[PDB]
DNA sequence: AGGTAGTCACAGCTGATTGCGCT
DNA sequence: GCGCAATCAGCTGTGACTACCT
């Protein structure tokens, strides 16, 4: 509260320091927890602290986490009560409770089951143990339209009443700034009304300790709760959302990104879950596998929520889902569900559980907020550092290298700025010799290489130079396929060019070398995906950017999300032996010709 | 950052020690306790962070030794010197055993080397070594225990320094061989502490700047399983490794091992 | 040419963090190394391409 | 500065006077490097002189630097001496004086260094070690703040003349409190060792104009730093001289006394570091400090911005803006680095090394930035109509010493402005004498 | 005296057309 | 002549740059 240096002061508010230093936890009036990790019952106060809040930052020293309000409906969800949070809180916190934390805690966790929302018989209903905030939300305008045709009094039994169902998303989003937060409960245990299958897993698929955390969180006493699930892309994320799948026990809808994600998930499936392929069906429009009395079915966004006139065996199938019940429907990169089409596609379909899975939960807009009702509070987050300390994760070995503007180019570059500058210093001649010199001694060292490259005008030159396989995008489908087959198990091959199109879950093969030129302007979920690429020093990545540029200050700002996870960026400013030996553009003639070809765009 | 702990094993032997006083001699226990002691406080005055122990063999068992001079100094001399004393007049020959128990005083060093290395904190490195001064004869029947505590050492890599000051052990040469020790014999007595300062004194790291002595004849002779004596050729068997002087149809350990 | 290959090996190899990077070290400890244990951790924390 | 070059420029009768206590000659050896001291130590029983051949082939030909390294700072030191060995051999023999000494405080003989403890009993007032580390670092936070300016620290006025002096702070008006200068800055983000002994090392010097001896002082100071600590001595038996540096290191929090009067002093902590963890830095620029003291808050928050304070616990973030602010203050960053690097908690001392390389290279590159641009006055000089003109200019600029760049290829050079009129001076006088 | 819908680049998807192959 | 695969039109997501009202 105090401004003596610039910094909030909390000195006065907290001086419960008993005796003396063995709680290894530190609270914040407005709301925040510090924890040291240095401590001999470090494992117990994470486990307490990931049930009840998430992290801010995990570096190897002093964690930091968050408390918010969805965080506490996640904590009280779980058989954790509140008198049993405050009192372990009390219990380890080394300076006492603020009394601006218990009287938060309190409001927040008092309202957590008072309004449920249930599916039944291809109905939405709302129910409420009290019956008095019924007549509490009664009077908002917005709920009013839900009801139809006004729904009297729906007199059962508790009260309920029926709502919209295209008007969920509204009625999920006006509860929460009504203090009567919605909950997405599914008790599978006991249904008798939805036609569970047959699937079942393998006995042979073991589970890490941390995927065994996740899905124990997900279903807390019995029933399975819509949460989102944040595990990086080489660690095991498919295999958690088919074993959730098999204990939901019922018809699943997976949701893809990419036409070629919904063959993964299919693999998956059949690896890990021992399902006829009569059952298994994937929607995607290319062959039509009798998606209708499937079990399971795949598909893919951009599809299912089309505003265009649709092909007539699509809309049959689409028609044909809209009429029953779906369990455990699941979604895959789900930081990119707050789209404008793809927030509505969860109002399209009918389903009782919401399970999204993703790798990097950052995204710009902050519209990550509105996830948390889009589909629920945010279940498990990983923490990377200790997951790769057990050496189920690569340790890649983060490295900044840049590179100085040649004179050739930087006079131009401070010369314009109506967006002409982009391939000034994506074609920076010194970042060029830097990349041909990184490829050439990983390839002498045989380790495999990734280059992503967007602006692929620029890449096309960066990749016919040296002579080596890329992939532009809008080549083709069989191409691109057979490229990466044969990228993994070919030792004539092993580095390859991907423009902006490995910025998804794809199959690409396990590589130990990226190197990401020119990338998106502040996209860390970009950076964060291009990383979890490689990991599965066994690798280390390299990011090649271009001193006294706009790339410098992109990159300074994109990798705030990764020192959050607890990654650390060496900056490297000597290549060692690039003098050594021979390299492209070592005279100025070829330096000062790249200037024409680089400005002939002219793109007006 | 540098921290050097030296921990002198000293071969009080009654026996030994009073023939010699017997000799007339112009070396004395008194005068070896006093190198030793100079020794350390040399040991000390190398650097602050320098440990000392010392540790006095004996028939019975191993003693833990440990105006106008270094005030740390006139308590660790005091120290040792009633130790010394303590030991010496309470020692009573019970029973015929006459040979020292060396390998026991290298055990505890090894056990105390190991309890201080924990309490160094992690941002020094302990370099630890083990001067020992031999005056008996060396014991044949501790062989086992002997090479143990040989192998213990070159595992924690532990230097092991030899001072024979009467007659050649082969144990402590095949310490100093494997250990990378020095292995040095007195040629007169009395010249003690000049040999001390001028060979054991610098650390690992400067024997590497100075120029040392070449290594003596280490020899390897074996110690036979029911004998206990050093052989040369003997047989050995093929399962268990034990080494025996004579040939025998069948192999005892192996029957013993069921 | 020749002239040509090091005019642009002096612009690039030492453009902006040469000209005091290279001062600094002419004006350094210039003697052995400190303890082999920070030798050691430079080695660990180096990346392949700077060992060789 | 350290004490071997302070050594190094005495005259040879102060340091042959210097030998003559026991802990003076102790106090030297320690200082002495690894190989020194085996020398001193072999050369310990020597009546007699040892070829200058011989003692160099004691070490090997690769290492033969470090030995004349050792042997250079041994003559300098004056430790031995060369002696004119008959047969016009050069003899390498130790000081009498400093061997004697020497053998004295290893061997024993003589008097103990105090007068004696137990005359006097058991003292009335005695206090206990936690209490002289809390009197101790109470005197030196003192200290500190006065040359912050803070009212809550009140010291003598002496005190306030020697900071002047050492240039710390200076005094533009009389009457009104000094202002700290970019050197005080720099002595506060030095180590407390550190700072001890460029103090003492200040008042060694300084100490000519109060009239005192150098070498009981300096004999006295190494008496202390071998001191037992918690052990009280008997104040009689100096110097009324000496009773003045004697209250001065009591103001200082050197040593405690309960009264100016009283015969017993307690050297205390820092006294015996005169001689010679609590900030846990993360990858992400953030110090995590485990002090309570505003004086560790003050010294943090000069080159990094605060974030939380909690009452055992501060956070602070390391940015960009915030330590070219401390630079531009006059700190550099190897000052910043080696006091991150000494304060570094326990927990960082299992990392090789303790502080992460990603950030004291970013710290390095943030000391770059604001020097990226050189600055240097002059005059150019571009008409010369002929290449031998040009060369004869340039290498009578060369021989004055006021060249700043030269350009042979484009006949171009720049002049200091002082030199300037002597080169226009020279021109004139060349063209009039052609 | 200080902030958001068009606009641009680069990818994705699905909905048709549309020339190419034939024991 | 029929059938399969290549191709484009239209719509959308992501991130950043730019011209008029409280
Ligand atoms: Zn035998
Ligand atoms: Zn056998």
């Given at each position: 509260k ?6 909030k ?5 907290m001086?419960?320091?008993?005796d ?10 407005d709301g925040?927890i510090?924890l ?16 009840i809040?998430?992290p ?12 918010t309000?969805?965080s ?14 405050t009192?372990?809180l009390?219990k380890?916190?080394?300076?006492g409770?603020?009394?601006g ?8 966790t008092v309202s957590?089951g ?8 291809n109905?939405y ?16 305008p917005v709920?009013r ?5 006004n729904?009297?009094?729906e007199?059962?039994?508790?009260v309920?009443?029926?709502?919209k ?11 929460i ?12 245990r006991?249904?008798?009304?939805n ?6 897993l393998?006995?042979?698929?073991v ?6 955390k996740?899905?124990?969180?997900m ?12 595990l ?20 699943c ?15 998956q ?11 298994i069906?994937?929607?995607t429009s290319?062959a039509?596998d ?9 598909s893919?966004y951009?599809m299912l ?32 569900i ?19 899975l ?5 995204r710009?807009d ?8 889009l ?17 189920y ?33 994506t074609m ?7 990349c041909?010199?990184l490829?050439?001694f ?7 290489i ?22 532009y995008?809008?080549?083709?489908q ?16 092993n ?19 990226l190197?990401?030129?020119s990338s998106?302007?502040g ?10 690429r490689?990991?599965?020093y ?14 410098m200050?992109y990159?300074?700002k994109?990798?705030?999300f990764?020192?959050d ?12 032996g690039?003098?050594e030996?021979?390299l492209?553009?070592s005279?100025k ?16 | 950052?540098e921290?050097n702990?030296?921990v ?6 009654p ?11 112009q070396?004395?226990?008194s ?13 000390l005055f190398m ?6 122990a010392?540790?006095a063999s004996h ?5 833990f030794?440990?105006?106008?001079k ?5 308590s ?12 010496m ?5 019970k ?16 056990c ?12 020094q ?8 001064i ?11 225990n002997?090479?143990?505590?040989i ?21 402590l040469?095949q310490?100093?061989?494997?250990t990378?020790?020095l292995?040095?014999?007195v ?18 790291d400067?024997r590497?700047?100075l120029?040392?002595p070449?290594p ?8 036979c ?16 490794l ?14 013993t091992a069921? | ?19 005091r ?6 004006k350094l400890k210039?003697?052995?190394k400190?303890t082999?244990?920070?030798?050691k ?12 | ?6 050594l ?15 802990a ?25 002189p ?6 160099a ?7 033969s630097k ?11 030191l004056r430790?031995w001496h ?5 047969g016009?051999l ?10 004697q000494?020497?053998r ?14 137990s005359?006097?009993?058991p ?5 206990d070690?936690?209490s002289?580390?809390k009197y101790?670092?109470?005197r030196?936070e003192?200290?500190?703040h ?9 010291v003598?006025?002496?005190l ?7 240039g710390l ?11 700290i200068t970019?050197?005080?800055?720099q ?9 001890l002994?460029?103090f003492?090392?200040?008042?060694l ?5 109060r ?6 002082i ?15 001595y ?20 050197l ?8 015969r017993?002093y ?10 010679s ?5 993360e ?15 003050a010294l943090?928050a000069?080159?990094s911005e605060?974030?939380?304070?909690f009452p055992n ?8 803006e915030s330590?070219?602010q ?10 910043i ?13 299992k990392?090789?090394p ?10 390095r ?19 010369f109509?002929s290449q ?12 004055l ?6 350009n ?9 402005p002082?030199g ?9 006088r ?5």
């Amino acid at each position: 509260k105090v401004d003596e240096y610039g910094a909030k002061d909390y000195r006065l508010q907290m001086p419960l320091k008993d005796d003396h230093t063995s709680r290894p936890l530190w609270v914040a009036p407005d709301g925040h927890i510090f924890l040291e990790a240095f401590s001999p019952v470090y494992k117990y106060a994470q486990d307490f602290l990931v049930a009840i809040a998430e992290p801010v930052c995990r570096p190897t020293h002093v964690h930091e986490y968050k408390l918010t309000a969805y965080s506490l409906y996640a904590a009280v969800s779980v058989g954790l009560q509140t008198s049993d949070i405050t009192e372990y809180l009390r219990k380890l916190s080394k300076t006492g409770v603020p009394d601006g934390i218990m009287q938060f805690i309190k409001l927040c966790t008092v309202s957590y089951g008072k309004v449920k929302l249930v599916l039944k018989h291809n109905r939405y209903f709302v129910e409420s143990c009290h019956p008095d905030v019924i007549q509490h939300l009664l009077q908002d305008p917005v709920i009013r339209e839900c009801r139809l045709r006004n729904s009297e009094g729906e007199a059962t039994e508790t009260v309920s009443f029926e709502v919209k169902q295209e008007m969920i998303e509204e009625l999920q989003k006006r509860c929460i700034h009504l203090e009567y937060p919605l909950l997405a409960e599914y008790d599978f245990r006991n249904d008798s009304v939805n036609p569970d299958i047959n699937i079942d897993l393998k006995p042979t698929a073991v589970l890490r300790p941390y995927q065994e955390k996740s899905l124990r969180k997900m279903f807390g006493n019995g029933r399975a709760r819509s949460g989102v699930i944040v595990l990086p892309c080489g660690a095991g994320k498919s295999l958690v959302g088919v074993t959730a799948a098999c204990t939901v026990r019922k018809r699943c809808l997976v949701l893809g990104n990419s036409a070629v994600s919904v063959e993964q998930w299919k693999a998956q499936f059949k690896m890990w879950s021992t399902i006829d392929d009569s059952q298994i069906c994937r929607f995607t429009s290319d062959a039509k596998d009798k998606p209708i009395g499937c079990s399971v079915a795949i598909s893919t966004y951009s599809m299912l929520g089309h505003t265009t006139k649709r092909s007539w065996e699509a809309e049959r199938v689409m028609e044909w889902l809209k009429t029953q019940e779906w369990g455990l429907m699941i979604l895959d990169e789900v930081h990119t569900i707050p789209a404008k089409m793809f927030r509505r596609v969860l109002t399209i379909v009918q389903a009782h559980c919401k399970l999204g899975l993703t790798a990097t939960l950052v995204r710009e807009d902050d519209k990550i907020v509105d996830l948390n009702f889009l589909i629920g509070p945010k279940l498990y987050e990983a923490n990377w550092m200790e997951l790769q300390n057990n050496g189920y994760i690569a340790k890649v070995q983060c490295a900044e290298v840049w590179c100085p503007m040649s004179p050739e180019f930087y006079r131009e570059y401070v010369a314009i700025k109506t967006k002409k500058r982009i391939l000034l210093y994506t074609m920076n001649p010194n970042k060029f010799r830097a990349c041909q010199f990184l490829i050439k001694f990983h390839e002498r060292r045989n380790d495999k290489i990734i280059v992503f490259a967007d602006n692929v005008f620029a890449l096309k030159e960066y990749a016919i130079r040296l002579n080596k396989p890329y992939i532009y995008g809008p080549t083709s489908q069989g191409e691109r396929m057979q490229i990466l087959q044969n990228f993994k198990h070919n030792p004539k091959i092993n580095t390859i060019f991907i423009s902006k199109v490995g910025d998804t879950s794809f199959d690409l093969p396990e590589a130990n070398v990226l190197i990401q030129i020119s990338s998106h302007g502040g996209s860390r979920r970009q950076e964060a995906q291009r990383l979890g690429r490689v990991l599965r020093y066994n690798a280390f990545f390299y990011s090649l950017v271009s001193q006294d540029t706009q790339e410098m200050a992109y990159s300074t700002k994109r990798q705030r999300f990764l020192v959050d996870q607890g990654y650390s960026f060496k900056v490297i400013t000597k290549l060692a032996g690039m003098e050594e030996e021979d390299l492209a553009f070592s005279t100025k003639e070829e330096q000062q010709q790249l200037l024409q070809k680089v400005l002939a765009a002219t793109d007006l | 950052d540098e921290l050097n702990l030296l921990v002198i094993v000293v071969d009080a032997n009654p026996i030994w020690w009073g023939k010699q006083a017997l000799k007339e001699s112009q070396f004395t226990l008194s005068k070896c306790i006093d190198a030793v002691m100079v020794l350390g406080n040399s040991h000390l005055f190398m650097n602050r962070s320098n440990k000392l122990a010392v540790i006095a063999s004996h028939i019975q068992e191993s003693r833990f030794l440990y105006d106008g001079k270094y005030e740390l100094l006139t308590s660790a001399n005091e120290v040792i010197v009633e130790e010394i004393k303590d030991l010496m007049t309470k020692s009573d020959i019970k029973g015929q055993h006459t040979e020292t128990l060396l390998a026991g005083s290298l055990a505890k060093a090894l056990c105390y080397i190991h309890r201080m290395n924990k309490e160094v904190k992690d941002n020094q490195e302990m370099k630890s070594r083990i001067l020992v001064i031999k005056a008996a004869e060396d014991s044949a029947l501790q062989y086992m225990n002997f090479m143990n505590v040989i192998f213990a050492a070159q595992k924690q890599n532990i230097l092991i320094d030899a001072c024979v000051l009467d007659s050649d052990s082969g144990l402590l040469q095949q310490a100093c061989d494997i250990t990378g020790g020095l292995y040095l014999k007195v040629p007169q007595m009395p010249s003690l502490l000049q040999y001390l300062l001028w060979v054991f004194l610098p650390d690992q790291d400067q024997r590497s700047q100075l120029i040392l002595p070449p290594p003596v004849h280490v020899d390897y002779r074996a110690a036979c399983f029911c004998h206990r004596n050093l052989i040369e050729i003997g047989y050995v068997c093929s399962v268990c490794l034990s080494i025996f002087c004579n040939f025998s149809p069948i192999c005892t350990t192996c029957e013993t091992a069921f | 040419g020749t002239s040509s290959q090091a005019e642009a090996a002096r612009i690039l190899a030492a453009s902006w963090p040469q000209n005091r990077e290279d001062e600094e070290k002419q004006k350094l400890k210039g003697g052995p190394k400190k303890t082999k244990r920070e030798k050691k951790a430079a080695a660990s924390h180096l990346f392949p391409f700077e060992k060789l | 500065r350290n004490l071997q070059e302070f050594l190094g420029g005495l005259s040879p009768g102060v340091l042959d006077r210097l030998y003559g206590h026991p802990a003076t000659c102790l106090a030297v050896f320690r200082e002495l490097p690894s190989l020194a001291k085996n020398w001193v130590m072999r050369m310990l029983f020597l009546e007699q002189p040892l070829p200058q051949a011989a003692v160099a082939l004691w070490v090997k030909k690769e290492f033969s630097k470090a030995q004349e390294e050792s042997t250079g700072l041994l003559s300098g030191l004056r430790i031995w001496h060369t002696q004119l060995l008959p047969g016009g051999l050069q003899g390498l023999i130790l000081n009498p004086i400093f061997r004697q000494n020497l053998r004295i405080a290893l061997l024993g003989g003589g008097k103990a260094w105090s007068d004696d403890t137990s005359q006097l009993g058991p003292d009335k007032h005695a206090r206990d070690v936690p209490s002289l580390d809390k009197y101790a670092e109470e005197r030196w936070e003192v200290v500190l703040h006065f040359m912050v300016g803070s009212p809550s620290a009140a010291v003598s006025q002496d005190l306030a003349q020697l900071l002047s002096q050492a240039g710390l702070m200076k005094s533009t008006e009389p009457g009104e409190p000094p202002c700290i200068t970019s050197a005080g800055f720099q002595f506060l983000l030095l180590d407390t060792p550190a700072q001890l002994w460029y103090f003492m090392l200040q008042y060694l010097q300084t100490a000519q104009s109060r009239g005192m001896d150098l070498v009981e002082i300096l004999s006295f100071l190494f008496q202390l730093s071998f001191s037992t600590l918690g052990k009280d001595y008997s104040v009689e038996g100096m110097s009324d001289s000496l009773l003045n540096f004697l209250q001065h290191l009591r103001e200082f929090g050197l040593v405690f006394q309960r009264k100016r009067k009283s015969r017993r002093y307690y050297p205390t902590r820092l006294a015996i570091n005169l001689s010679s963890g609590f900030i846990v830095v993360e990858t992400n620029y953030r110090l995590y400090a485990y002090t309570e003291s505003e004086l560790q808050i003050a010294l943090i928050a000069l080159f990094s911005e605060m974030l939380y304070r909690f009452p055992n616990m501060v956070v602070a973030q390391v940015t960009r803006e915030s330590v070219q602010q401390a630079i531009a203050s006059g700190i550099t960053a190897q000052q910043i680095i080696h006091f991150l690097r000494t304060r570094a908690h326990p927990v960082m001392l299992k990392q090789t090394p303790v502080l992460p390389p990603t950030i004291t290279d970013q710290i390095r590159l943030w000391e770059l930035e604001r020097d990226r641009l050189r600055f240097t006055e002059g005059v150019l000089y571009n008409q010369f109509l002929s290449q031998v003109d040009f060369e004869l200019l340039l290498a009578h600029a060369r021989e004055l010493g006021v060249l700043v760049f030269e350009n042979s290829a484009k006949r171009l050079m720049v002049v200091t402005p002082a030199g300037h009129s002597d080169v226009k001076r020279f021109w004139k006088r060349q063209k009039h004498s052609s």
